[PDB]
Amino acid sequence: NEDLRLHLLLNTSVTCNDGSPAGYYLKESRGSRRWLLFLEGGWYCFNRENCDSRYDTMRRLMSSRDWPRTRTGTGILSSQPEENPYWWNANMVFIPYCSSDVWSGASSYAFMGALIIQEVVRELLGRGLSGAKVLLLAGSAAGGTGVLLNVDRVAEQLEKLGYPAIQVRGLADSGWFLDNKQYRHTDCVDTITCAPTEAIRRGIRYWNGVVPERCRRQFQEGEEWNCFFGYKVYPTLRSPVFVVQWLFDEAQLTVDNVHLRLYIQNLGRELRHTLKDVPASFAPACLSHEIIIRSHWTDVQVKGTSLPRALHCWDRSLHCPVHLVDSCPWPHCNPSCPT
Numbered sequence: 001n002e003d004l005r006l007h008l009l010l011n012t013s014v015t016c017n018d019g020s021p022a023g024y025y026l027k028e029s030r031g032s033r034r035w036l037l038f039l040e041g042g043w044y045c046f047n048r049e050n051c052d053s054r055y056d057t058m059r060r061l062m063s064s065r066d067w068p069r070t071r072t073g074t075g076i077l078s079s080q081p082e083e084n085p086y087w088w089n090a091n092m093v094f095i096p097y098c099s100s101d102v103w104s105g106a107s108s109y110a111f112m113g114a115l116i117i118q119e120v121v122r123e124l125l126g127r128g129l130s131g132a133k134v135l136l137l138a139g140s141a142a143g144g145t146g147v148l149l150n151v152d153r154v155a156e157q158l159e160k161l162g163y164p165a166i167q168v169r170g171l172a173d174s175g176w177f178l179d180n181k182q183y184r185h186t187d188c189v190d191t192i193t194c195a196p197t198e199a200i201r202r203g204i205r206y207w208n209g210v211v212p213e214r215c216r217r218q219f220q221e222g223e224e225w226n227c228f229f230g231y232k233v234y235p236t237l238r239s240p241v242f243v244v245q246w247l248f249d250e251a252q253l254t255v256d257n258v259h260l261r262l263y264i265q266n267l268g269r270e271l272r273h274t275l276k277d278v279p280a281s282f283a284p285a286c287l288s289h290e291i292i293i294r295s296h297w298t299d300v301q302v303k304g305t306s307l308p309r310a311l312h313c314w315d316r317s318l319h320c321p322v323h324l325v326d327s328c329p330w331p332h333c334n335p336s337c338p339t
């Protein structure tokens with residue numbers, strides 16, 4: 001009924017990590033010229049040991065063999081007006097994360113995250129995307145970072161094939177991280193604990209990871225890893241991109257080696273600073289991780305404006321405030337924070 005339905009890619013060369021076919025879930029919207037393509041998150045692995053361990057304990061993130069044939073859209077993928085006041089009628093696409101590579105892989109464990117996005121788009125042309133006017137590439141966590149890496153690729157691809165009437169845009173949620181110093185230094189062993197900078201150096205070589213050419217050209221060769229960090233990729237992006245980022249992201253803190261005060265401040269403070277020249281943003285002062293596909297994404301507010309209203313104001317100003325960093329230095333100084 002309102003279910004998004006599973007499709008597997010007709011090009012079987014484009015796969016999940018274990019060779020199973022990749023795919024996408026879709027709920028078509030009679031009428032709408034608006035497309036929402038959401039990239040799922042779920043960490044990553046950068047060497048054999050970590051990927052083997054991910055494969056045994058979090059196998060859904062590496063294979064499509066057990067994917068259910070349908071799933072219900074939630075938050076911004078919801079078709080219920082109460083849950084998704086402005087976007088409920090869009091064409092809804094969910095792209096499951098089965099490449100453990102922050103959607104950067106292009107080598108044909110296989111790491112193919114960038115080609116999966118590429119392939120999904122090509123398929124959707126023949127499903128009404130050909131007749132589309134707005135394409136919003138959204139994603140949470142690793143999927144939030146994957147938007148940054150892919151949004152201009154997706155734009156370029158759609159010109160090449162003869163579809164300049166589609167406007168590609170980005171929404172990066174909980175995907176904007178700092179390449180910073182750890183609280184308590186430690187070796188690059190576990191995914192959860194390895195430092196942000198070393199993790200991706202490892203990752204990019206392991207995944208034959210590719211980054212957007214406009215960021216790539218403007219770095220020394222073998223230095224491509226820099227382009228995983230929002231502040232370094234962003235000013236280079238041609239596509240308009242809205243940034244949703246908790247000031248105190250739980251994933252950020254886990255790789256900075258915190259386990260539940262002067263350090264916190266510095267992080268929270270620099271986040272404000274990295275975001276002061278991104279005009280499209282929504283950074284509530286809470287302790288959390290991800291929001292755009294949670295049903296309670298309508299409850300959060302900064303400066304009187306909800307997240308759904310901010311994105312709408314952002315959308316209106318592209319065809320009502322849009323830059324909204326919550327103003328304090330402490331998690332739980334904002335009464336509408338979740339749970």
Ligand SMILES: CCCC/C=C\CCCCCCCC(=O)O
Nearest residue numbers: 041042043141142145177196251
């Ligand atoms: C937070 C680690 C440094 C960020 C570097 C590259 C992007 C990876 C983002 C993965 C977020 C991990 C949490 C998740 O995906 O649910």
